[PDB]
A paper describes a structure:
Proton-dependent oligopeptide transporters (POTs) belong to the major facilitator superfamily (MFS) and transport short-chain peptides from the extracellular environment into the target cell. Previously reported structures revealed that the bacterial POTs possess 14 helices, of which H1–H6 and H7–H12 constitute the typical MFS fold and the residual two helices, HA and HB, are inserted between H6 and H7. PepTSo2 from Shewanella oneidensis is a unique POT transporter that has been reported to assemble as a 200 kDa tetramer in the detergent-solubilized form.
Tetramer formation was confirmed by a single-particle analysis using cryo-EM and was further analyzed by X-ray crystallographic analyses using lipidic cubic phase (LCP) crystallization. Although square-shaped particles were clearly observed in the cryo-EM micrographs of PepTSo2 reconstructed in Salipro, the overall resolution was limited to 6.7 Å and the quality of the map was too poor to refine the atomic model owing to severe orientation bias. To alleviate the orientation bias, we tried to collect data by tilting the grid from 30° to 50°, which drastically improved the data quality. However, the atomic-level oligomerization mechanism remained unclear because of the resolution limit. In all of the structures determined in this study, each PepTSo2 protomer adopts a similar inward-open state, which might reflect cooperative substrate transport in the tetramer.
Residue numbers in the entry:
A (entry chain B), B (entry chain D), C (entry chain C), D (entry chain A): 8 to 133, 137 to 266, 270 to 345, 356 to 413, 421 to 492
Amino acid sequence: VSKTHSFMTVSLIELWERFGYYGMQALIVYFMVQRLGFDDSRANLVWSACAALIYVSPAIGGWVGDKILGTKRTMLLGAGILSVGYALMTVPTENTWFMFSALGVIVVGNGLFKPNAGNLVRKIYESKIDSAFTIYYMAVNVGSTFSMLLTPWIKDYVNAQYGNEFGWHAAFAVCCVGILVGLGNYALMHKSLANYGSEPDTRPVNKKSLAIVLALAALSVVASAIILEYEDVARVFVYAAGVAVLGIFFHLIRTSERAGLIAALILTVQTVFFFIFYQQMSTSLALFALRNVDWDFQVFGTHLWTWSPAQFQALNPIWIMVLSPVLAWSYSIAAKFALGFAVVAIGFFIYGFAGQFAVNGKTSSWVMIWGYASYSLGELLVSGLGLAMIMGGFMMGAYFVASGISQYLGGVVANFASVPQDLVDPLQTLPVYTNLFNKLGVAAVVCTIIALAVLPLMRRLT
Amino acid sequence: VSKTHSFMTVSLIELWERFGYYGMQALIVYFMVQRLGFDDSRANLVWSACAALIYVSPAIGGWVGDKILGTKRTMLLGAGILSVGYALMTVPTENTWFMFSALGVIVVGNGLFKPNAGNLVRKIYESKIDSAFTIYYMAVNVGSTFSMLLTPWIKDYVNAQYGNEFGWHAAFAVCCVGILVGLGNYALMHKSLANYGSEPDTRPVNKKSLAIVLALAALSVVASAIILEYEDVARVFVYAAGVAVLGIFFHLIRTSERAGLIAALILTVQTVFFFIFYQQMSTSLALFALRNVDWDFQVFGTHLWTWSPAQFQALNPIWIMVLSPVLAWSYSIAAKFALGFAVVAIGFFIYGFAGQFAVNGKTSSWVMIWGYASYSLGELLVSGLGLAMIMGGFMMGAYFVASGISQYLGGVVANFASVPQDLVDPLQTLPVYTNLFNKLGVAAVVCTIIALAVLPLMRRLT
Amino acid sequence: VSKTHSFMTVSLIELWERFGYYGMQALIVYFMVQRLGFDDSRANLVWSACAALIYVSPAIGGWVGDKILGTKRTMLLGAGILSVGYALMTVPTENTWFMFSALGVIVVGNGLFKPNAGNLVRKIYESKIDSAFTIYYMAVNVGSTFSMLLTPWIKDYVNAQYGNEFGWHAAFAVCCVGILVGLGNYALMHKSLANYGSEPDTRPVNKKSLAIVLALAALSVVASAIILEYEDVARVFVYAAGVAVLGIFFHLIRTSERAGLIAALILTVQTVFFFIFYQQMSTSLALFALRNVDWDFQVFGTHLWTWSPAQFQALNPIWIMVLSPVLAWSYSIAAKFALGFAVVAIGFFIYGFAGQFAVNGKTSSWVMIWGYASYSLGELLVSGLGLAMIMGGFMMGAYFVASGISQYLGGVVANFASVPQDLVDPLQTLPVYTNLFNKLGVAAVVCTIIALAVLPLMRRLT
Amino acid sequence: VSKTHSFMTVSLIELWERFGYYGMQALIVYFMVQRLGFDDSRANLVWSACAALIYVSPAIGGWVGDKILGTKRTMLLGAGILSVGYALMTVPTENTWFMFSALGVIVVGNGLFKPNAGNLVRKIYESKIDSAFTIYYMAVNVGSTFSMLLTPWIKDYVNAQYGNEFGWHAAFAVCCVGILVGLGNYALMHKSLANYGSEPDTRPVNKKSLAIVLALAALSVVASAIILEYEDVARVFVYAAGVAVLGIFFHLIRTSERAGLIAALILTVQTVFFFIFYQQMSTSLALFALRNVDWDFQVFGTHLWTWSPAQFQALNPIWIMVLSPVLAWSYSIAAKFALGFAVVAIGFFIYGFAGQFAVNGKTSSWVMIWGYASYSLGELLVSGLGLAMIMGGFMMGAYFVASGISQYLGGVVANFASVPQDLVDPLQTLPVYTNLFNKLGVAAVVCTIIALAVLPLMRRLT
């Protein structure tokens, strides 16, 4: 019909699928602690190891749909794998297979979707696509905001009303229909994109091609599955990649004429220094949100509402929507890069800094609201790196696999919070929580220096 | 005679008529509490419901004088209705008809004046009329400053000197001669504008036209009158408008080709989010100025003067005159819009924040002087909206009637201060005043996000 | 010889004559309190009334030397009247004629000099004379700095060594040779300016002209003298000027076509609002520096040096030399004017604000160092007014005589510090000093509004 | 081979030789206090007097290598004199000849190197050599950072493990192989610079020239040696220079047509005002780091690592690498010069300011980390002076010799910390340390005024 009339049907199906994902990534780390009876140091590792599967997952979906099936059926097929992916999550037992089962089932379902969203959006224009994409990114951001503000309040509503543990699984179902919502938001308008097809679905489909794809999906389903039964295999797949991915450049650091490669490695070794700090909010900060912070969010002197145990992790698409034409105040190179590490640094100092004050037995209620603004403030302006530094065929995935490796090592950082499950009084939990955030932040200042230390070398080579 | 010699005779008659209005809007809310014996929750509603009549009132006067009588006689006729409008106010009884009588009598007297002031000023130029209007607006602002700084000090001077309640009515008479002043400021110079007539008073007047106008005025006088005898009718006129005014766009949100209409609704639904916060200074803050704040305005350690109970509401044309070429510091789109909500937000936090400290029995004397600067700081730069976004015949008044509806809902916000009239000790009043301003301000931060959440959508459509 | 070689001989003779003047204006107010046995309220008035003679005094010298004798002999004759002007000051008795005698003897000696300095400097160029004058002004400022930092330390050195009161007169002699220094700094180089003569001393001198000039000087000497014997005559000369100088514009406010005159009066009535606040540092602050401030200038915790009782008034050519290419940070109308009043305002609040804290019996040692920076910060950028707004013959002196009238009214402001001379314990002096500086500063904020209140009227008329 | 391929072999040999030097200038002042049994006031003077030899030392090496031997062999010969220069330092006795011996042996070894580094770098370009040099300067700065962070931790590792004093000499050997490292970093690549020779080593070498050079070196070795045996000779060589170097301009202040010379002296007398404040970090602050500061670097509440007694002096190439494209924020004359003195001033106030608080017996652990940032903040932007103000043959070294004289007078400033070696309890050391840093800083503000006091004179003469 029209350009902008075409634009919603990929915006809105993203707006609902993205709404599905964050309901998982909200409580599932905080889930497997007090209900099941996991220790916690086992439990930190799981989503830790899970996340590395997920950032590398746009590569596979970057391979499949643009080359085999066509984008649109891959945009179709990437949908309702999450339909199993939470209906399997919500069957109310406690047998610990289903839990670790469907987590990897998400991955190809995530994978066949995320570089299949914007890739067609990149071809309804043919370049001020930011004027198209900043609809979409702030369509993600309006969409992702609706998510975790809601998706544990359902979990709050149940488990002192219906009687037993029939509620943790219930809130999982909220995103389950939410992806089924995103079906019908497409299904009732799936004629709009008909003039903007990819390149295989110009021609009709191939079941000779399709059966292998779902088989290699079903290969990858079980491949992503067999991890969390005895976590040592997660190490062994990294130490074959994590040696050979530094070896990816060993073919062309000093052997290969144009040393922008190692300067792209200079960005790359800097890039891994990001994501190691991120995963703490999905890990230890969630444990920090369990047995220290009071849930009596009192402004000044009055009384307000008790928080969730974990809608803290919903604050993150507030600030990347607030501080996001603010950080588009242009007039009023990758080192804007750097000083954001110091934001992450001064982020971390705060968390002992209130526990410095208000020992009450417990911590101090507030704290977090300026915490999450810090990490977001560097998070906005630093993507596009080797995707900014635009002979390719290895240069493509070289940034990707290490990025997932960078995603992995947050768990092996965060392990020091392992209070034994016998220590009950949180007068003695805080002194082991204070000994981790500061010395994480001490070296977090030291990170700032290292980009600056080689900083004037870049201005010449460009 | 001359252009600038013509310019005073509309400036000065505005400068005196505007001087009349604020004497009413100063104490009349604080009037009907401790003298009559109203509760207070009845009393908040009255000026609350009165104000909605007044912002819609330039529309009717925008219809009458430019089309029927001519501007000048409408500029004449809009004057001395206030002459009854305060001489009726000042007759010293306590029978509660006169009070609610003349309040609506103001309205057409206000109505036939405010878009008849500047409309001729718009035609002594034929466009840097801001270089004409910023005389006028700061002629309003020099004029409006003289007002409420004075108009309750008269009320102070009486009621412990002359003996009884013969003083509340006395200060009302100060503006009564003040409008009679504005007669003679015109009447001794009413030959100057003779070359700048409208379009009916090019021709001679029509009593065949005039008698209906004053009849429809006298219709509207009683129509505006019959409200405050049993306040439920004020609801019922809103719920016929407030449904049909959202229905005004229902003819042309999704039916009507050019979606700037709903983006003008995006400004509009944002616009209503303003005025709901305004009316608190004309309502609850005045009650907050009665039985908490000490009147011992002590700078640092010395002694100064006891305040009025309500010249606080005079501070508002100070700051919109101070901060008003400051906010014309240009080089050193409607989202400048937005962050002013955060000013209104951080405005409100202060009021418990001093009561947080100086519990003395009572509150803490100071407080307010930085309070009123906040609301003004957003108030300067946000008008001109659909009057900035310039097929019209419904688009005109659609912003207006909802704006008065937006004016209305402040009273149904502010009702929570209803202390029963038996509770005397203000040690127990403050804990019910602290429970309202914070959670008004809590969501006042939440307002800031919502313009930002859809903010990048505007830059494309223009 | 050369341009710049000519430039010193008027720079340096200014640099020494200006060095002479400030030695007087340093302690002479603080002189006539504890030695003689004056009360203090008599003593405040004297330099108060003296100062008004002095700012009007460039007008008379603006008349004499450029028209009668020639600049150079008037530059000569304006010198060593101060030679009597301090040798008369230093004769060691206590008879109170000499004191009030030579104060007015300064005036014509000041008068025949200050507009005779730069007027020739204006004609060694024939216009980037600021590149000439900012040598000179910062030659004044390097010169004036050497002054009062030294000229009471001599007074410190004597009066507990030589035995009696033979020292107050001694420090007066320091500037006495200092003007005799400025003789020889000219006298050993008085051939340099020989090619840059005025216009009478092109021709030879006239004793027929000269004898009247010194007679009218000797008329003006006794005329300036007969003031301080019974101070009521000082009123009566103002109330003939101060009525007729407002009457100077009464010929041409509303009678005289071009209303920049009253806008120049708008600057003028604003201009008088300056100087009323200035004279406090030459008056009450000096009394505030007598019997409150401890002289134990302790940085942090150690020990430093005891101050003078009055080198505080030497701080003022420090800051107008520090903050003076700072305030020439241009890119990184007279309302820059205005906000400097708020600097003067926030200046004054400090003085009770430390006495708020450190009641020790006495005040708090520090205080002043940020005080004097405030008054200077507005003092730099506000001269040149009607001398900026460039049919003249009355427009010239109209700003001048009111400026001296503005100089006068500081004394009738500062009178409220009149502690009776019997009250010894400074525990009870501070509560009458706190009651004056705040309410001076309360209205000092109110001054800021008044320029802003008419501020947009100026941008049109220019 | 290539330009940038040539660029390392002078970068890296600088990067290792500079790495050698700072290992000495780190602990050698703190060395001769508690081990040997020196008082301290003798010990301050030694490196104090040593430093003056070192800044003048680029002049001699600016004479030798570019004119006699050729740069490259002078770049060769300037290396391994430090090889003796620390192997002599490390022979484990306590006879106090070796200590004062090899300190001057450094000097010609430093001298034949520092203007022989960049001088060839100035001729691999032939002018955006800053785009070459900011590699090098931040190659110095990446190199110099590796230094003192490490070179007393070796000294920590020994002297409570191996038993006795066999460790102070051990850490000296760390730089000894480090210069031997810088041999092989050249020696394994000494064919790269072969096309970029100086001008003597175009031709073959001369042993008829060489033997005098090493003899005049061996003259200068003993000449620099005979100082510290009885320190009065160090005075007598200054008072022959320090009179005649002010006499260097006495030939051409007022005798010599172009007064930029004295304005270059205006920079010069300002320039000496720098370096007097510097040497305190190499002197008294090191003593301040001995017997006041606790070594329990506790962030907030936890526990971290005990410091060194002197890696504080390693902080200085952190900040001049952090704050060094920050201070290259250009758009967002020598008076940028000036306000950095106020940074040095507000630097010094801090050191009593924490001892003001946390008297514990001892001082307060933290303190220093914001201290060293201050001195660096002026240190970046102020070099290049008479090397910026570009008839030479005396104008060259005139800035140099006074700069070393300026280097000298820090020791005669810092002498006031001479606690007698008997006073043990550091409750009584701090009150003599507080009495020095403040009144050093009191006049440090006074320095700021003096450039400003003559500041507008410069803008005309250029």
